[PDB]
């Protein structure tokens, strides 16, 4: 057992380890996306660089979750980071839909974890998620929402020109 | 009666005065440990300086609590700050156990107060404790938990050398 | 297939993706180690920080590998990241042996990949691994070897005392 | 013959002189493209500037080759630099396909020369090409591959407009 187990339940601990696996699948998916958009047959350095940053944000994510779990004295435990859903992410809007769907899944897992944390009454977990996960997701999901709307706006028979202008002018 | 006071229930107000008294007992206890580890027959200036910092932190604790009590229009009511649980804190590990147990008890009182804040529906109390209490306690109980683990790693037939190397190389 | 892909054979590409998966298992293992050594019953900030930097450096490893595979016109693809071997890593020498074994396994995969690149006549792959992998692992396996020797010079009948000194003084 | 000559085979000298002539054809080709894209009826100062830089990097190439050949006691037997394959290079993608075909042929000559370096046991030649030719051509062939994919993703009824946007937003 652990001497720092002040009010941190075994099912919240199991949920936080499940959340860490989710944030790891997210970092690994944004790694796959980040390098996919740098393949020569895709060649969108800015779309790449955006998902390179999201892999890093999700990496600060699982590092904060593990840091927090050790702060609560929980057992960190690890199971397979199952592979990113596609090895062929397709056009920028397709990949941005996949990124959006991944982040909405991830935010759902955080909202579910806060629902659990408030149900068990674990105020430090509520604070932690509130402080730098729930707002991290909401800002980032809004940013991907703006990107999706701009990619739908730029959609048409000239969609290739759309993706280039999206990348150069929005994604630096 | 207060003219500014809103939502802030009488049981929360009394529990905040109770938390102030607990944070004062804690501060006074860390004053006792802080000067105990500076006694000539104990002589662990780093262990002293650590508990001196905790007395300062638990002082910022009751000061933040009382500033908040006033901001909510609560009467700050001052009860006796009872004598610390010992004045012979003994070996560094046994003193650190007493600190750990005090700090866990203080965190438990904050969680009881947050649970009361939730049960009275007071968001600003919940925010205030989440902002700069529950974070402090979990970081500090973790820091004591690490100190205890290192002291239990160092404890043995050479325990006095263990206490010294802990005080020198962990506690500056 | 790719417009840029020159000389980069199918078995080089398969081996490089296998190396990316190996480096991902390595980062994930140094993550588990890094957070295990931060765990309250383990409490070794410098050992945690050492494996945190190895998770970081193995992350530069797979990111450099993927960057290179893209620069060679490979189709980077992703298997599951298999979990770290066992998460109760034992005492620091037991964990440092698990790290050494993992690192020698990883360096073996680099040497196998360079031998494969030499057997397929891929000079650029030979250069890339020479440039900032083979040196990178040899320096690091030397550093792990130094740490193992120190943890076997220490860590006899004084056991835990030697482990603490090793963390404080060797690992900052 | 030469008092410093060691392991530098007459085959390696003949191949290095052939590579120097080929890097001179490459710089001379990128001179023709560089000034063709500066031409009033073409007017793409970014595409011009891009090929002006490639002519410069291919010059740093043949100079560094000659500097090395003197470093190894070979004789710099120069040959006629044939005119580039066109001067009416056409649209930017169709010119840059020729830039790719040139650079991949230049990279093939490096790989042939490195294969000869291994087949004559010249570790210093192998290192020299590995150090600052092979990885340049790989990074450069990647960069052209990215530019071609962007240009094909900008080729269609939006041609010309996509060619200008490519210049304006990539080559600036």
Min Cα–Cα distance to chain C from B118, Å? 30
Q: What's the number of CA atoms in the CB half-sphere (13 Å) around residue D19?
A: 28
What is the C-alpha to C-alpha distance for residues C15 and C25, in angstroms, rounded to an integer?
15
Min Cα separation B140/chain A (Å): 9
Q: What angle do CA B94, B100, B105 make, to 5 degrees?
A: 130
D126/C4 Cβ within 8 A: no
- Best mutation target, C36, C44, C49, C160, to test chain B (most B CBs within 10 A): C160
Token output for B131: 């902002």
C167's tokens: 């963390």
C21 conformational bin, left if phi > 0, alpha if psi -120 to 50, beta if neither:
alpha
Distance from CA of C16 to the nearest CA of A (A): 14
Q: Locate all alpha helices (DSSP H) within chain B, ordered by sequence.
A: 10-36, 45-71, 92-119, 123-132, 134-154, 159-169
Which residues have a Cβ under 8 Å from the Cβ of D102 and sit 6 or more positions away? D26, D29
Burial of C29-66, coded b for 16+ CB within 10 Å and e otherwise, reads bbbbbbbbbbbbbbbbbbbbbbbbebbebbbebbbbbb
Place of tokens 């085979």: D9
Residue A158 is assigned to a ligand binding site = no
Provide, as residue numbers in chain D, all residues whose Cβ is less than 8 Å from the Cβ of C119.
none
- Contact criterion met (CB below 8 Å) for A15 and B160: no
Query: A68 CB contacts (<8 Å, ≥6 apart)?
Result: A16, A125, A128
Report the C-alpha gap between B13 and B77 in whole angstroms: 9
Q: Which residues of D touch C127 (CB under 8 A)?
A: 130-131, 134-135
Find out whether D154 and D165 touch, Cβ atoms under 8 Å: yes
Q: Could you tell me which residues come within 8 angstroms of residue B67 by beta carbon, excluding any fewer than 6 positions away? A: none
* Widest CA span in chain A: 63
CB contact under 8 A, B145 and A71: no
DSSP-derived secondary structure letter, C168: I
Cβ contact D170:A168 at 8 Å = yes
Chain D residues with CB under 8 Å of C123 CB are: 110-111, 114-115, 126, 129-130, 134
CB–CB of C58/C27 below 8 Å? yes
CA distance C166 to chain D (A): 39
Q: Quick one: which H or E segment has residue D162?
A: helix D161-170
Which residues are registered as beta bridge partners of D152? none
Residue C66 C-alpha from the chain's centroid: 15
Cα(D170)–Cα(D172) distance, rounded to whole angstroms? Answer: 6
Do C70 and A38 meet the contact criterion of CB atoms below 8 Å apart?
yes
What residue segments make up the domains of chain B, in order of their start? 1-171
d(CA C131, CA C125): 10
Cβ neighbours of A6 in B, within 8 Å: 104, 107-108, 111, 137-138, 141
Q: How was this structure determined?
A: cryo-EM
C-alpha B56/C-alpha B63 separation (Å) is 10
Q: How many Cα atoms within 13 Å fall on the side-chain side of residue B59?
A: 9
What are the Cα distances from residue A26, in Å, to A10, A33, B3, D123? 24, 10, 51, 44
SS3 state at C81: strand
With 0-12 / 13-18 / 19 or more C-beta atoms within 10 angstroms meaning exposed / middle / buried, residue A11 is: exposed
Chain A, chain D: beta-carbon pairs less than 8 Å apart: 44
CA-based Rg of chain D, rounded to a whole angstrom?
18
Cβ contact B141:B100 at 8 Å: yes
- Give Cα separations from C64 to C42, C57, C68, C100 (angstroms): 32, 10, 6, 22
Q: State the residue for tokens 């046994």.
A: B94
Provide, as residue numbers in chain D, all residues whose Cβ is less than 8 Å from the Cβ of A45: 146
Long-range pairs, A69-72, Cβ under 8 A, ≥24: A69/A13, A69/A16, A69/A17, A69/A20, A69/C35, A70/B142, A70/C35, A70/C38, A70/C39, A70/C40, A71/A4, A71/B138, A71/B139, A71/B142, A72/A4, A72/A5, A72/A6, A72/A8, A72/A13, A72/A124, A72/A125, A72/B138
Place of tokens 């001196």: B52
Residue B172: closest C-alpha in chain C: C168
First to last CA, chain D: 50
Say how far apart CA D126 and CA C123 lie, in whole Å: 8
B1-171 — its CATH code? 1.20.1260.10
Suggest the residue from C4, C68, C69 to mutate for an interface test with chain D (most D CBs closer than 10 A). Answer: C4
User: Chain C contacts of B142, Cβ < 8 Å?
Assistant: 40
Torsion of CA A129, A132, A133, A135, to 10 degrees: 110
Cβ(B56)–Cβ(B68) under 8 Å? Answer: no
Is chain C touching chain D, with at least 3 CB–CB pairs below 8 Å?
A: yes
* Element containing residue A143 per DSSP (H, E): helix A135-153
What are the structure tokens assigned to B113, written together? 């107060």
**Short-list C32, C28, C15, CA closest to A31:** C28
Query: C35–A70: do the CB atoms touch at under 8 Å?
Result: yes
| Nearest CA distance, A158 vs chain D (angstrom) | 7
What one-character-per-residue DSSP string does A76-87 give? -----BPPPS-S
């Amino acid at each position: 057992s652990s001497q720092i187990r002040q009010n941190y339940s075994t099912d919240v601990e199991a949920a936080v380890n499940s959340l860490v696996n989710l944030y790891l699948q997210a970092s690994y998916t944004y790694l796959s996306l980040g390098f996919y958009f740098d393949r020569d047959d895709v060649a969108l350095e800015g779309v790449s660089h955006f998902f390179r940053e999201l892999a890093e944000e999700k990496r600060e994510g699982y590092e904060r979750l593990l840091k927090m779990q050790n702060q609560r004295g929980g057992r960190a435990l690890f199971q397979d980071i199952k592979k990113p859903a596609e090895d062929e992410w397709g056009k920028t809007p397709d990949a941005m839909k996949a990124a959006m769907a991944l982040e909405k899944k991830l935010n759902q897992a955080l909202l579910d974890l806060h629902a659990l944390g408030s149900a068990r009454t674990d105020p430090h977990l509520c604070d932690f998620l509130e402080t730098h996960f729930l707002d991290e997701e909401v800002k980032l999901i809004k940013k991907m929402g703006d990107h999706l709307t701009n990619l739908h706006r730029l959609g048409g028979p000239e969609a290739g020109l759309g993706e280039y202008l999206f990348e150069r002018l929005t994604l630096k």
